[PDB]
A paper describes a structure:
At the Fab A172C site, the linker binds within a pocket formed between the Fab’s constant and variable regions. While the linker portion of the linker–payload was well resolved and modeled, only weak discontinuous payload density was present near the linker, suggesting that the payload itself makes few, if any, specific interactions with the Fab. The Ala-Ala-PABC linker conjugated to A172C binds in a hydrophobic region in the Fab pocket, burying 326 Å2 of solvent-accessible surface area. The maleimide forms van der Waals contacts with E152 as well as dipole–dipole interactions with the backbone carbonyl of C172. The benzyl moiety engages in multiple interactions, including a van der Waals interaction with the Cβ of E157, a dipolar interaction with the backbone carbonyl of L174 and pi–pi interaction with the backbone carbonyl of S159. Hydrophobic residues such as V173, L174, Y180 and Y149 shield roughly half of the linker’s solvent accessibility.
ADCs uniquely combine the target-specificity and extended half-life of antibodies with the potent cytotoxicity of small-molecule chemotherapeutic payloads.
Residue numbers in the entry:
A (entry chain L): 2 to 213
B (entry chain H): 1 to 99, 105 to 135, 142 to 220
Write the structure that this text describes.
Amino acid sequence: IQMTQSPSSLSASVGDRVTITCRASQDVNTAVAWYQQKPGKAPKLLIYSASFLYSGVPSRFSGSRSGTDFTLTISSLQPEDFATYYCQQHYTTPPTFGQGTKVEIKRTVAAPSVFIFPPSDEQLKSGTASVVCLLNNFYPREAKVQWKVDNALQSGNSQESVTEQDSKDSTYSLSSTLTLSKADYEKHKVYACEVTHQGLSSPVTKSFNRGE
Amino acid sequence: EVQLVESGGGLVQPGGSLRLSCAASGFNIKDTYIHWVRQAPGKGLEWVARIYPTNGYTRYADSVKGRFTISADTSKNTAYLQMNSLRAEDTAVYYCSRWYAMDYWGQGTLVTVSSASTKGPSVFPLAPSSTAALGCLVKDYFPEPVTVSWNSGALTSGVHTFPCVLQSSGLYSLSSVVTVPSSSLGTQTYICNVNHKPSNTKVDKKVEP
Ligand SMILES: [Co+2]
Ligand SMILES: [Co+2]
């Protein structure tokens, strides 16, 4: 038995209505449950037997059935509900989970403030230099970060990482790290980080020169 | 109060073995079914095995059939899961749970199957210039977890601790920063507290402008 979940991704604003559908490949009867999972953490029971609210969760969540089509609906959304939601059948072993539905809180466009960090003197002694670009509390997640070593656009030597949506202002933060050998790092002077974002009218560039 | 806690787990060589224990409080396992559900990082939950402690019947998954063994000890109120011939595919967070819908879970344990040896992290400071930003750089380390706190837990507002990124060395790295007023730069002291249990490495770094 395979359970299929739609939509795989979701982005609805606060107070909106969210509906999440779960298809059963075979008959699973009412033996289904709906779960919610914050990043890492542990799944929390929301709905049991396709319709019944769990003791402890608000009545904003609800569950219904249309044969093999099980839908979980949120009446009023809150920004405390950024999570991935799962549907699980338990009619026959093995108990099958859904593919997951990551819901994102939608908000207004917020430009990112940008900082650039030169490599530390301790890391330079090790033999590696790391230049960090930090994008601070922005929305949406989509952003382009490019590096310009001595005004030369780099390619493939940068790694990126983004935080989960903030529980207060529903923003993301991003880190782009430029990792080079200390030898090449001691070869060039001007290190620059260029950010383009929907909330930036022009692409902002924060930079530093070795020997500042 | 009713809770479940999992122990055991960590770095395991491929083809190796490792056993996980899930202890139960606030209820008797003999009254319910005990489940082990795993989840690879950002890959969704996959059911592994089930046991009914009062009779001992064990139901497994085909992705684990043969090399896994799930047992129970109704007297100690804990369930077990023995895993042999561990593969990289088996790397995941392993949860424990009970039934009938699975209501109460456990925090889980990290089972990592890799040939990379345990390595402690190197911690470097990210200092501000000229709001202002500062942070720490958790360099090559393996395996996860790594706790990062600021001022032993005092500093909590404006902190962003980024997830791990796999590096070309086969080791992980992460950065943790915090948004602070530029006036606080001279007056206030900022220290980040890095905690890597697998290597038993604890480093506190004072980030100085
Ligand atoms: Co089938
Ligand atoms: Co921030």
